[PDB]
Scaffold this motif. Structure first.
Motif, mmCIF file in Angstrom:
data_model
loop_
_atom_site.group_PDB
_atom_site.id
_atom_site.type_symbol
_atom_site.label_atom_id
_atom_site.label_comp_id
_atom_site.label_asym_id
_atom_site.label_seq_id
_atom_site.Cartn_x
_atom_site.Cartn_y
_atom_site.Cartn_z
ATOM 1 N N UNK A 60 -9.265 170.329 45.104
ATOM 2 C CA UNK A 60 -9.010 171.625 44.743
ATOM 3 C C UNK A 60 -9.831 173.009 44.934
ATOM 4 N N UNK A 61 -10.430 173.107 46.408
ATOM 5 C CA UNK A 61 -11.013 174.050 46.802
ATOM 6 C C UNK A 61 -9.582 174.822 47.152
ATOM 7 N N UNK A 62 -7.936 173.825 48.092
ATOM 8 C CA UNK A 62 -7.228 174.429 48.268
ATOM 9 C C UNK A 62 -7.160 175.464 47.352
ATOM 10 N N UNK A 63 -7.107 174.653 46.259
ATOM 11 C CA UNK A 63 -6.247 175.311 45.720
ATOM 12 C C UNK A 63 -6.856 176.516 44.445
ATOM 13 N N UNK A 64 -8.230 176.882 44.476
ATOM 14 C CA UNK A 64 -9.188 178.215 44.295
ATOM 15 C C UNK A 64 -9.034 179.095 45.467
ATOM 16 N N UNK A 65 -8.487 178.540 46.451
ATOM 17 C CA UNK A 65 -8.778 179.946 47.697
ATOM 18 C C UNK A 65 -7.404 179.496 48.577
ATOM 19 N N UNK A 66 -6.455 179.010 47.812
ATOM 20 C CA UNK A 66 -5.528 180.380 47.738
ATOM 21 C C UNK A 66 -5.175 181.077 48.041
ATOM 22 N N UNK A 67 -5.717 181.887 46.432
ATOM 23 C CA UNK A 67 -5.614 183.464 46.681
ATOM 24 C C UNK A 67 -5.725 184.385 47.366
ATOM 25 N N UNK A 68 -6.480 183.840 48.877
ATOM 26 C CA UNK A 68 -7.306 184.753 49.026
ATOM 27 C C UNK A 68 -6.985 184.072 50.795
ATOM 28 N N UNK A 69 -6.819 182.372 50.585
ATOM 29 C CA UNK A 69 -5.676 181.989 52.491
ATOM 30 C C UNK A 69 -4.936 182.281 53.029
ATOM 31 N N UNK A 70 -3.463 182.709 52.002
ATOM 32 C CA UNK A 70 -2.316 183.490 52.249
ATOM 33 C C UNK A 70 -2.516 184.400 52.965
ATOM 34 N N UNK A 71 -1.250 184.469 53.712
ATOM 35 C CA UNK A 71 -1.207 186.016 54.812
ATOM 36 C C UNK A 71 -0.972 186.951 53.768
ATOM 37 N N UNK A 72 -2.872 187.586 54.738
ATOM 38 C CA UNK A 72 -2.841 189.496 54.331
ATOM 39 C C UNK A 72 -2.749 190.078 55.524
#
Length: 2046
Positions: free
Chosen positions: A1906-1918
């Motif tokens: 769940x943490x990965x799902x909710x933080x993938x919005x900003x863990x992606x390459x910016x």
């Protein structure tokens, strides 16, 4: 899972079954919760506690307290609970609760149903479902049966148990929340004291509240994981919890449950309450009852309609209760006896008729056989029924007689010689008789229950063997009413189309002395052709549903001439002959065809309107064998059964558009009442025989026989009662026929005359006992006679009373007579007021008494003032009706009425004159009555005038003129933004400020409202006829080309491609709105095509409206130029002359077509003059004058073009109109609303999704919404059952003295959307709701102060791709939503909508709004925002610049309804389909509505946060971050800070907590005085300085006050130029000029921070600064070293203002600014000279400084704005320097700063308070002040290095914000942390968000998923940020050392359970706040300067500073105090593995 609730784990299914089975055989034992209580007191306590903790949570939470998700289910959803509190205690009166058998568990007497319901809730965790209920019920019933009445009580008992559970849980959660806040306060007090001496005392105080686990849970989480921590209190708590064997992990684990269990149980309770409110408890009881397992087989029980089945069950239950037999055996015995009855029937060949034994004729036989003991009520009712009509006559006679004796004894004291006695008694009998009748009716209706018939449920329609036809008697003495009568026929058919029913028609051409003049054959042929067209249009499966019958007229005598053997009775008798086969009739060939046999015939009439499926119920009730007539062969009187069924008649609300005052006086009850099912009647419940009034179903054969055998002749109008007497009529009182009432008084006189004639033509039928008359019929005739003679009796009684005695005490007699008439209605008034002898206590049910009291007073007044006229008419009627058959003779004004009646005044004058002379003591009482009686015509005229209902509003002319001008102004939107570019569709909205952009999307609602507005515009007279056809045809063709899914559209579309934006989502609302508008369009086209001969000339008022708009536009012209006003006055006289010409045309009635040419010539002249004005004046406002002149001459040309129709060959246009109407109707009806129907919970789905093909999840459940229009259309079309209309809505909020409806977010786009098409009448609920909500909106507006009109609109808040957003709004009183009182946004179109009920107030509100900036080119704007969070600077309002399409459509439609008397409402209701369901609306409002539970208004609106700091120097530092995405800067409260640009820094800065004197500064030095100080509050600060800093968004405003000279500065970062703006403002108050000079100082550097702090000499060397021409700007950059440097030139701009030109100085050398040995606090540039020698070039120490000497006057202000521009290339700063060199330039940038910061704060889900908290966190994150870090002991034994790299964290450019998560049901603090990280990244702060999980290996995998799902919005390459700094480590995976290192190395550490973000950060500031105050005001001690140095001997090379000490072994350096060497002369003294060097004046490094 303990809490205090009722938990018994799960049970699933197949365990509930045998659980109930065990309960039935051997149950009891115990129950999970359960205790000894009384039902009623416990329910009252439950309600009280729930109200307590609803108000507590309401007054909390909004105060700014964290609310648990368990309490959310109680706040957001409270209304379901408030109806759930009802029903219970409404379904359980005291007598009913005592009937349930008791179970006696554990010694407590508990009814069996209560215990059975306790187990269901306990074993299912309060989750109610139908199948589980059925499983439990039948499992329990395996052995023990459940009686009827018990099985009904299960849902209510379940509701009771659920509400008890909710009360327990709510109390516990509220107590836990209070304990949590108490723990927070106590631990904060412990941490606030460092000493342990008071901690023990405080813990001793708190010891009483430590045992509860909800207290010590937060205590430990706040002490173990903190900053300053503990070690005395923690030990004490550990000792306490280890005592009594509790430890601490047990309490730790307990809160993981309990809390989660509380949340889950509250959610389950809410869902179960909703579900119980949703399902239908009729099918469930039908299937789960054992007694229906007996009747559903072997007898006709399953098809008997619900009411009859319920009556059968009630009779069975009553028999079983009062008898030694139980229910199953009594049902069995009834079945057996019904079998023994023998069927003996035609259709009743199979099954068993069980009805003839329970409610039939043999009820007494079984009742006696089974030992039933009757009630006293049943005994007396049976006795009264046995005494036939005498039971009604005797009590009335006794009451009359007691009245006689009372009045005779009380009034026998004045002469009255035994003859006056008889006269007065006989004349007073009649009012006494009416009083007695009223009293008897009240007693019967209060005691005897109503009587209901039994009938079939024709669920498939009326079958064969029950064929019926509806034969409306009609007349053909007209020309165009044939169309009306046909329309009545289609409406009657559409009332119930299903079945074998026919709709005939019978007609005649009135009377004529001749036989047949052969002159109406054309009328007959036209009627026959129309009916043939009707049959062709409505004929399915080869069936002719409509018939026409006509009669040839036969001569009988004079008067009636030639109208057959008899009147309508003869017509019906001939029809009866012709149906059964009779060829020698009196009908016409070609119109004498009837449907074969036909068993039952319904009569009906022309104006009596039928209800939906209202005849199928009557046919079934007649067809059922119990109600079938038998016809005694002894005499044809129909002994048993019934011959005629007469339904009750309900008056309609209003007669269309006519509602007289007369209507609201003589019809108190008006409209349908859905709550009542049967009405108690006095005759039918006692004699079982009602009265026939000419409308009702009857058997053909029995009626024909009983009438042909009895009546000979002499029937005119009294026949109906005669057939009701010979046959056996009945009142069903279940099906009701809505009838109109005559608004004028002329019709009522005629009707009363006809009734009197009929009643008085039947005397021998009563006088003679021969012939054939029923016993009750004679009594009915006598009652009619007495009711007819009451007026004359009152007249004669009064006249003889004041004549004969003529006493002084006639006042008591007169008031007695008046008292009788007042009293007679009041019994009926009071009959519905008694609460059944105060059985139970309901909620605030209002009174609503004054209204009907006033109505009855008015009724009595009209009666008392019309007695004379009514009596005279009744006298002439009686004498006429007597002379006949005894002598056997065989629009206007007041003057019109006066000459018509003329009898009442003359008769009153005659009586007064006759009784005035004798006695001479009765004039005082005779004058007033005669005075009111002679002023009769005026009263009749006043009451015959039609009043205003809702359409015919008193708008005068100026108000309608202004409204029409507003509508013409807002139609410019549709004129402009509709183009034939494959578009023909209005765009949604239209931006205008961020460059005008037009949207390209459209909904069905927009198309519908646009088409409706086009029709309205053609109605107004704005466009020619051809234009309307073209626009409608184009729109309809585009719609037909549109993509569809089973008829519906896909909501959003494209305007140029006609494709769908996103998912093809069908919307239920939009489809309904479009179809409803298309029906109106079709009706309009039909009306236009039926007569295109006079509908072409037009209104000639649009030309007036555009002229008025031009005149109003002219006034907004400041014509004050060199020519003064020659052309302005010329054009003004031209326009007034044009208006005069138009008025002259208008008063002319012939409408000469040549005058329009002159009007066009004048229009051309005005346009030419306007163009001439525009050629010389180029003002942006004169374009409006040009456009309006052009539109005026377009309107003139349009009317000319209309005036040129040939009007001879009108056929092609008629064909086009007919085809267009057909296409519109087919397009509307093609929409299918079947698949959207949810047949589980009724209602409708939100919409349909074409992907995966599933319905939506929610439904519509409120009456006041647009779902009202959608459901009305769907019901009328016939795709939903009727009950859906009654299922939704009906909730009342009490406002003022009454109650309106209730809606989600109670705005006005949904209360007032349907009335644009739907009609609302005077008496209905809907219009009074509309009036009340308009008044409430006015109240809300006046209490806020702002203009009213809250509704859905775009509010002032933009975003990326700025589009102002869009959301719902409303008023808090009518909303049922939390958050409606925080916005307060006003939309203009709501005022226009509200003008249909109050045009004056709407116009005043619009006038107020126009004085603001809320009127653009295309009518009004969308909204004006008043919320302070969305209003800039000191402005009071905030206009939104949008033009939404359907908003303008609604505005135009509402104006059209108001101005033209509601044409749109009439168009929609003319369609027969809609007219059939029009009668559904009605719904008389019940006057007993329950009341729901409830300067604050101006305080609840959202307010921005402005952090104000009193004294920044002596208080904790606070910082603010300002950025535009690329240029990020910081400002501390003292003014220090830095500046960044895309990572690389600009101004040199270092994080030094003690010094904090880095960054740019502004210094002010007085010239005359010589003293210098700082504009900020840190570097210099001198005596005085009442300083103040105000941090907010955008700006950072610094205040200062130095001895009568204020100086405020403002620091802001610019937009789209990458610059920072600093504005200083000098204020002088004293009467003197001050001469001060402003200095700027900023040290520049262009490097990525780390390169700067590494080797400062490179950074300072590689910086070139230079100044060019116009020396007020300094440019600096780095010299090109390599081909990888960005360059990034920067500049510093002086940008002066407010003064003449003076020379300025600059300095770019820090050696000559600071001074080689000083610091910024004591710099050398502020000495008494050496003013900035302006060195430039490759200075090795670069700074930027600019100085301008200013001169502030005495009272005025100056300003200097320093700019700091940074740009990538050199040629780009010039585009930025010149943009900022201009004056002002600080406004017009401020507004962009505000808009962009608001957009940034909206693009991330943050609030201003959250912004302040996050800025506090950023302060704690950048500066090394560590006050939110870990404990001292947690840091000493931790914080190792070479770690945190195994967790893939750099920990180099990372302050590392950790967040320990061990809660896993909140999961919301993680989102707040992520949002804070994103916001701080946007503001220019770089850090790491490490989310540490601290769980075991049980749920860790799901937590990390769940943490990965909710933080993938900003863990992606910016891009350019390279891996983003978001982490989620696992404690279990890594070892303990790494975990300790991570927790010690984080600068700020917050736990997730112990607080919440933005609540822990704000609390940390308060606990760490509060000696350093006397050192701040001393400034500095100037500087030191010694007297050189004496050059002595003993030095070889004696320079100015020092020399060798001989032998070269030393170098002595001699200095004074303050002096210094040119550079540090160091000496390195080192060794192999250590070293240090020390300077000559003192230094150190090692």
């Amino acid at each position: 899972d303990h809490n205090d609730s009722i938990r018994a784990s799960y049970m699933t299914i197949e365990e509930l079954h045998d659980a109930g089975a065990a309960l039935s055989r051997d149950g009891a034992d115990s129950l999970p919760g359960f205790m000894e209580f009384d039902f009623f007191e416990r329910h009252r306590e439950n309600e009280k506690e729930i109200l307590r903790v609803y108000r507590t949570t309401a007054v909390d939470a909004e105060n700014g307290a964290t609310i648990t998700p368990a309490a959310e289910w109680l706040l957001d959803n409270h209304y379901v609970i408030e109806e759930a509190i009802q029903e219970v205690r409404r379904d359980f009166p005291r007598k009913f609760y005592r009937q349930l058998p008791t179970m006696t568990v554990g010694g407590v007497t508990i009814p069996r149903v209560m215990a059975l319901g306790w187990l269901y809730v306990a074993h299912t965790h309060s989750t109610v479902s139908r199948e589980n209920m059925t499983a439990l019920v039948d499992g329990y019933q395996t052995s023990q049966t459940l009686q009827i009445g018990e099985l009904w009580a299960l849902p209510s008992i379940i509701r009771f148990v659920l509400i008890e559970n909710l009360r327990r849980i709510s109390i516990r959660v509220e107590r836990s929340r209070r304990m949590r806040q108490k723990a927070n306060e106590v631990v904060d007090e412990i941490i606030r004291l460092n000493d342990a001496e008071a901690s023990a005392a405080l813990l001793k105080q708190v010891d009483s509240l430590v045992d509860d686990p909800t207290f010590a849970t937060q205590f430990l989480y706040r002490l173990r994981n903190g900053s300053q921590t503990s070690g005395f209190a923690v030990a004490w708590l550990e000792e306490r919890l280890h005592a009594a064997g509790t430890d601490a992990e047990n309490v730790m684990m307990s809160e993981h449950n309990r809390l989660a269990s509380g949340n889950v149980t509250m959610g389950n309770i809410v869902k179960s309450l909703r579900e119980i409110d949703d399902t239908e408890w009729s099918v469930w009881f039908e299937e789960v009852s054992h007694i229906d397992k007996v009747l559903r087989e072997e007898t006709d029980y399953e098809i008997l309609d619900f009411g009859s089945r319920n009556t059968y069950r009630n009779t069975i239950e009553l028999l079983a209760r009062r008898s030694p037999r139980t229910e199953v055996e009594v049902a069995r015995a009834a079945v057996e006896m019904a079998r023994s009855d023998l069927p003996a029937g035609a259709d009743e060949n199979h099954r068993v008729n069980v009805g003839s034994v329970l409610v039939g004729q043999r009820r007494f036989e079984l009742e006696k056989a089974l030992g039933y003991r009757p009630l006293a009520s049943q005994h007396i009712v049976r006795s009264m029924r046995k005494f036939n009509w005498l039971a009604i006559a005797a009590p009335v006679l006794l009451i009359t007689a007691v009245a006689m004796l009372a009045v005779g004894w009380f009034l026998a004291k004045a002469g009255m010689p035994w003859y006056v006695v008889t006269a007065f008694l006989l004349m007073f009998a009649l009012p006494a008789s009416e009083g007695a009748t009223g009293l008897f009716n009240t007693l019967v209706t209060f005691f005897v229950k109503p009587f209901r018939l039994v009938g079939y449920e024709f669920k498939n329609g009326i079958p064969e063997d029950a064929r019926t036809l509806v034969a409306v008697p009609c007349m053909l003495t007209s020309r165009d009413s044939v169309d009306e009568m046909m329309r009545n026929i289609e409406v009657h058919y559409l009332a119930n189309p299903h079945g074998e029913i026919y709709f005939s028609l019978v007609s005649d051409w009135r009377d004529a002395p001749y036989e047949q003049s052969d002159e109406d054959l054309e009328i007959l042929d036209y009627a026959k052709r129309e009916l043939a067209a009707l049959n062709s249009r409505y004929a399915f499966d080869g069936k002719t549903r409509f018939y026409l019958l006509h009669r040839r007229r036969i001569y009988n005598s004079a008067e009636e001439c030639w109208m057959g053997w008899e009147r309508k009775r003869g017509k019906l008798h001939e029809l009866n002959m012709l149906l059964r086969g009779d060829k020698d009739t009196t009908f016409l060939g070609g119109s004498n065809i009837v449907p074969a046999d036909v068993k039952y015939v319904m009569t009906l009439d022309a104006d009596t309107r039928l209800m939906r499926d209202a005849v199928t119920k009557l046919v079934g009730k007649m067809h059922h064998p119990i109600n079938r007539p038998k016809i005694d062969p002894v005499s044809g009187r129909v002994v048993e059964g019934y011959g005629l069924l007469q339904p009750r008649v309900t008056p309609s609300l209003t007669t269309g558009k006519d509602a007289s005052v007369f209507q609201r006086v003589f019809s108190i009850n008006r409209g349908i009442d859905p709550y009542v099912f049967t009405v108690s009647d006095v005759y039918q419940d006692l004699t079982s025989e009602g009265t026939f009034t000419g409308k009702g179903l009857y058997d053909v054969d029995a009626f024909e026989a009983a009438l042909k055998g009895r009546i000979e002749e002499n029937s005119i109008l009294s026949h109906d009662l005669l057939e009701g007497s010979f046959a056996r009529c009945a009142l069903v009182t279940d099906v009701e026929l809505v009838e109109d009432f005559p608004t004028r008084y002329e019709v009522e006189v005629s009707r009363q005359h006809r009734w009197a004639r009929g009643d008085w033509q039947l005397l021998p039928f009563i006088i003679d006992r021969a012939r054939g008359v029923t016993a009750i019929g004679r009594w009915k005739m006598v009652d009619n006679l007495r009711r007819s003679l009451t007026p004359i009796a009152w007249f004669f009684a009064s006249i003889l009373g004041w004549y004969f005695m003529d006493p002084l005490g006639a006042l008591i007699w007169q008031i007695l007579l008046i008292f009788s008439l007042f009293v007679a209605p009041t019994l009926s008034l009071l009959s519905g007021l008694v609460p059944r002898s105060t059985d139970i206590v309901p909620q605030a049910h209002f009174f609503t008494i004054w209204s009907e009291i006033r109505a009855t007073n008015a009724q009595v007044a009209l009666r008392i003032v019309f007695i004379a006229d009514a009596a005279c008419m009744m006298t002439d009627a009686i004498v006429r009706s007597l002379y006949r058959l005894l002598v056997s003779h065989k629009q206007g004004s007041i003057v019109d009425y006066y000459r018509q009646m003329w009898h009442a005044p003359v008769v009153a004058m005659l009586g007064l004159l006759f009784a005035a002379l004798p006695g001479d003591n009765a004039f005082l009482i005779g004058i007033p009555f005669t005075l009111l009686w002679v002023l009769s015509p005026a009263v009749a005229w006043y009451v015959s005038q039609s009043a205003e209902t809702e359409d015919r509003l008193f708008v005068s002319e100026h108000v309608s003129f202004e409204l029409r001008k507003i509508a013409r102004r807002t139609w410019r939107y549709y004129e402009a933004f509709v183009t034939p570019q494959e578009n023909h569709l209005p765009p949604d909205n239209f931006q205008e400020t961020p460059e005008p952009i037009v949207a390209s999307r459209t909904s069905p609602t927009n198309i519908g409202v646009y088409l409706l507005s086009v029709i309205s515009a053609r109605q107004f007279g704005w466009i020619s006829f051809a234009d309307t056809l073209e626009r409608i045809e184009n729109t309809i063709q585009t719609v037909e080309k549109m993509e569809k899914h089973r008829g519906h559209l896909y909501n959003w579309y494209h305007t140029d491609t006609l494709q769908t934006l996103g998912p093809r989502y069908v919307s239920a609302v939009d489809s309904g709105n479009l179809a409803g508008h298309l029906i109106a369009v079709s009706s309009a086209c039909r009306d236009w095509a039926e007569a295109p001969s006079a509908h072409l000339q037009g209104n000639l008022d649009g030309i007036g409206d555009v002229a008025g708009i031009l005149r109003e536009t002219l006034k907004a012209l400041p014509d004050n130029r060199k020519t003064l006003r020659p052309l302005h006055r010329r054009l003004e006289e031209r326009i007034i002359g044009f208006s005069n010409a138009l008025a002259s045309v208008k008063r002319e009635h012939e409408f000469a077509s040549i005058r329009v040419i002159n009007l066009a010539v004048l229009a051309r002249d005005i346009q030419k003059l306007a163009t001439n004005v525009d050629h010389e004046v180029k003002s942006a406002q004169s374009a409006e004058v040009t456009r309006w002149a052009q539109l005026l001459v377009e309107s003139c040309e349009a009317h000319i073009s209309d005036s040129a129709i040939d009007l001879t060959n009108m056929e092609p246009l008629r064909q086009r109109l007919a085809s267009l109407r057909d296409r519109s109707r087919n397009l509307a009806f093609s929409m299918d609303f079947t698949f959207l129907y949810r047949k589980d919970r009724r209602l409708l789905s939100i919409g349909y999704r074409v992907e995966s093909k599933e319905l939506d999840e929610a439904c519509y459940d409120l009456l006041a919404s647009e779902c009202r229009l959608t459901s009305l259309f769907a019901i009328a079309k016939g795709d939903l059952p009727t009950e859906h209309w009654y299922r939704l809505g009906r909730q009342v909020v009490p406002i003022g003295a009454q109650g309106a409806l209730v809606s989600w977010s109670g705005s006005m786009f949904e209360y007032l959307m349907p009335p644009l098409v739907m009609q609302e009448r005077q008496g209905g609920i809907l219009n009074q709701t509309n009036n009340l909500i308009v008044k409430e909106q006015m109240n809300h507006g006046r209490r806020l102060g702002t203009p009213w009109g809250i509704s859905e609109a775009a509010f002032n808040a933009r975003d990326h791709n700025m589009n102002y957003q869009y959301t719902n709004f409303g008023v808090p009183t009518l909303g049922l939503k939390r958050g409606l009182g925080q916005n307060a946004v006003i939309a203009p179109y709501a005022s226009i909508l509200a003008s249909q009920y109050d045009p004056d107030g709407a116009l005043e509100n619009l006038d107020k709004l126009r004085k603001l900036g809320a009127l653009g080119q295309y009518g009004f704007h969308d909204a004006v925002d008043f919320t302070p969070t969305r209003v800039p600077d000191g402005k009071v309002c905030a206009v939104v610049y949008n033009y939404y399409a359907h908003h303008h459509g609604m505005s135009i439609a509402a104006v059209a309804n108001v101005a033209f008397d509601g044409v749109l409402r009439e168009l929609f209701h003319s369609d027969p389909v809609i007219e059939a369901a029009e009668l559904l609306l009605q719904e008389k409002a019940p006057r007993e509505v329950p009341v729901m539970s409830a300067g604050k208004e101006q305080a609840d609106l959202l307010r921005a946060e402005v952090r104000s700091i009193a004294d920044p120097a002596v208080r904790d530092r606070e910082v603010v971050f300002l950025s535009n995405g690329h240029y990020s800067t910081m400002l501390t409260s003292t003014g220090a800070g830095y500046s960044k640009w895309n990572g690389q820094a600009i101004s040199r800065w270092k994080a030094d907590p003690t010094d904090d004197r880095w960054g740019t500064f502004i210094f002010l030095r007085d010239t005359t005085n010589g003293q210098w100080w700082s504009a900020t509050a840190e570097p210099r600060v001198i005596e005085g300085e009442k300083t103040k800093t105000i941090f907010t968004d955008d700006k950072a405003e610094f205040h200062k006050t130095i001895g009568d000279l204020q100086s405020v500065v403002e620091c802001i970062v610019a937009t789209e130029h990458d610059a920072e703006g600093r504005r200083i403002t000098l204020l002088n108050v004293g009467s003197e000029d001050r001469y001060i000079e402003v200095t700027s100082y900023m040290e520049p550097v262009i490097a990525s921070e780390d390169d700067d702090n590494a080797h400062p000499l490179f950074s300072r060397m590689f910086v070139q600064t230079e100044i060019g021409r116009r020396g007020d700007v300094i440019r600096a950059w780095r010299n090109r070293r390599s081909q990888n440097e960005p360059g990034t030139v920067i500049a510093h701009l002086a940008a002066d203002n407010a003064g003449p030109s003076r020379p300025t100085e600059f300095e770019t050398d820090r050696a000559k600014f600071i001074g080689r040995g000083r610091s910024l606090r004591e710099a050398a540039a502020f000495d008494a000279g050496a003013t900035l020698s302006s060195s430039d070039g490759f200075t090795l120490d670069p700074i930027l400084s600019l100085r301008r000497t200013v001169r502030v006057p005495a009272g005025k202000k100056v300003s200097v704005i320093f700019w700091t521009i940074a740009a990538p290339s050199r040629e780009e700063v010039d585009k930025a320097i010149d943009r900022y060199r201009h004056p002002d330039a600080f406004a017009h940038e401020l507004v962009h700063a505000w808009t962009r910061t608001q957009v940034q704060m909206r693009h991330v889900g943050v609030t201003s308070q959250q912004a302040a908290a996050f800025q506090h966190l950023g302060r704690y994150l950048t500066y090394p002040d560590m006050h939110l870090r870990a404990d001292s002991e947690t840091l000493k034994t931790g914080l190792a290095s070479q770690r945190a790299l195994w967790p893939l964290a750099i920990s180099g450019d990372f302050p590392i914000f950790s967040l320990r998560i061990n809660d896993d049901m909140d999961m919301d603090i993680a989102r707040e942390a992520l949002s804070a990280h994103e916001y701080l990244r946007s503001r220019g702060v770089i850090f790491d968000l490490v989310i540490v999980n601290e769980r075991a290996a049980s749920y860790a995998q799901d937590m990390q998923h769940a943490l990965d799902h909710i933080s993938e919005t900003q863990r992606r390459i910016n891009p350019a940020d390279g891996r983003p700094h978001v982490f989620s480590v696992r404690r279990d995976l890594m070892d303990e050392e790494t975990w300790s290192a991570l927790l010690a190395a984080s600068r700020v550490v917050l736990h997730v359970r112990n607080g919440k973000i933005v609540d822990q950060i704000n609390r940390a500031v308060s606990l760490f706040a509060a000696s350093d105050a006397a050192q701040a005001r001393l400034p500095v001690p100037a500087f030191p300067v010694a007297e050189p140095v004496e050059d002595a001997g003993d030095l070889d090379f004696w320079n100015g500073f020092g020399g060798f000490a001989k032998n070269g072994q030393e170098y002595v350096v001699r200095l004074n105090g303050g002096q210094s060497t040119p550079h540090p002369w160091i000496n390195v003294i080192s060794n192999e593995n250590f070293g240090f060097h020390i300077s000559a004046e003192g230094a150190g490094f090692s």
